[PDB]
């Protein structure tokens, strides 16, 4: 298991997300689903010129899996996935995101719900999760598990327990007071409200 430090600005963004009083937390689902859709667009596009890219799975979809027993909500997609480098760069650094602009925006009156317009929607997961585990598999690399409870660091390790063909799984270990997001009616309401136009099937698993 390798431990990494988030780039300063990313740690600062996470702190803002976790400590800022903001009740409209439900937008976290919209942001993760949007990331999955983008990931699906990528593999869809690449498969146009190279059909073998789908040998790891032709189905392009998004699955929502609540589990009250483990108190987790998992967003799974069969998108492009992330190589080890992609994981570390995408989640541990500013990279191509608008992290800087977002933080400045918040001081200029912007709202946290606007996070997705700055390429950092993933971090909205910390509005409801105390810990986030990301399992991912890209055609060009092995399966990896990224994990962080914030605090300035994250870990990365190989993941062999259960292979996932291709894609990304975002496991949200919910805060004790955010279990409403495990309720079927609540999840359906949120998807219909913010993700009704996603161009891939979204299946809500029953417990």
Ligand X SMILES: O=C1OCC/C1=C\Nc1ccccc1
Ligand Y SMILES: Cc1cc(C(F)(F)F)nc(N)n1
Q: Which is nearer to ligand Y, 120 or 174 (CB)?
A: 120
**Cα distances (Å, whole numbers) of residue 11 to 47, 58, 158, 187:** 35, 36, 24, 28
Q: What's the rounded Cα separation, in Å, for the pair 195 and 75?
A: 13
Size of the site for ligand X (CB under 6 A): 11
Size of the site for ligand Y (CB under 6 A): 13
Kindly list the strands in the beta sheet with 72-77, ordered across the sheet, starting from the edge strand earlier in the chain: 2-5, 153-158, 144-148, 129-137, 167-174, 72-77, 62-67, 202-204
Q: Which is nearer to ligand Y, 7 or 179 (CB)?
A: 7
- Tell me how far, at minimum, the Cβ of 161 lies from ligand X, in Å: 24
- Tell me how far, at minimum, the Cβ of 82 lies from ligand Y, in Å: 5
Instruction: Count Cα neighbours of 143 within 13 Å in the Cβ-side half-sphere.
Output: 14
Q: Which of 20, 38, 55, 183 binds ligand X (CB under 6 A)?
A: 38
Q: Which of 102, 122, 146, 181 binds ligand X (CB under 6 A)?
A: 122
Q: What contacts 2, CB < 8 A, 6 or more positions away? A: 155, 156, 157
Residues numbered 123 to 152 that lie near ligand X (CB under 6 A) are: 123
User: Residues 174, 129: contact at Cβ < 8 Å?
Assistant: yes
Residue position matching structure tokens 């161009």: 199
For residue 120, the partner it binds in ligand X, ligand Y, none, with Cβ less than 5 to 8 A by kind, is: ligand X
> Does 39 help bind ligand X (rule: CB under 6 A)?
yes
Q: Which is nearer to ligand Y, 26 or 77 (CB)?
A: 77
Residue position matching structure tokens 């990528």: 42
User: Residues 82, 138: contact at Cβ < 8 Å?
Assistant: yes
Q: Which of 60, 66, 78, 81 binds ligand Y (CB under 6 A)?
A: 81
Q: Which residue is nearest to ligand X, using beta carbons?
A: 122
Site residues for ligand Y per CB under 6 A = 35-36, 39, 77, 79-82, 90-91, 122, 134, 168
Site residues for ligand X per CB under 6 A = 35, 38-39, 42, 90, 97, 119-123
């Amino acid at each position: 298991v390798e431990t990494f430090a988030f780039q300063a600005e990313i740690a600062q963004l996470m702190s803002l997300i976790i400590n800022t009083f903001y009740s409209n937390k439900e937008i976290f689902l919209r942001e993760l689903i949007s990331n999955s859709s983008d990931a699906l667009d990528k593999i869809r596009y690449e498969s146009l010129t190279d059909p073998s890219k789908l040998d790891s799975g032709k189905e392009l979809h998004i699955n929502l899996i609540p589990n009250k027993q483990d108190r987790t909500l998992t967003i799974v997609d069969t998108g492009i996935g992330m190589t080890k480098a992609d994981l570390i760069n995408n989640l541990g650094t500013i990279a191509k995101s608008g992290t800087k602009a977002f933080m400045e925006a918040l001081q200029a009156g912007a709202d946290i719900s606007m996070i997705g317009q700055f390429g950092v929607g993933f971090y909205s997961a910390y509005l409801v999760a105390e810990k986030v585990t990301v399992i991912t598999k890209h055609n060009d690399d092995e399966q990896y598990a990224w994990e962080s409870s914030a605090g300035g660091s994250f870990t990365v390790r190989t993941d062999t327990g259960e292979p996932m063909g291709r894609g990304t799984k975002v496991i949200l270990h919910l805060k004790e007071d955010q279990t409403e997001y495990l309720e079927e009616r609540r999840i359906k309401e949120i998807v219909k409200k913010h993700s009704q136009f996603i161009g891939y099937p979204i299946t809500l698993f029953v417990e």
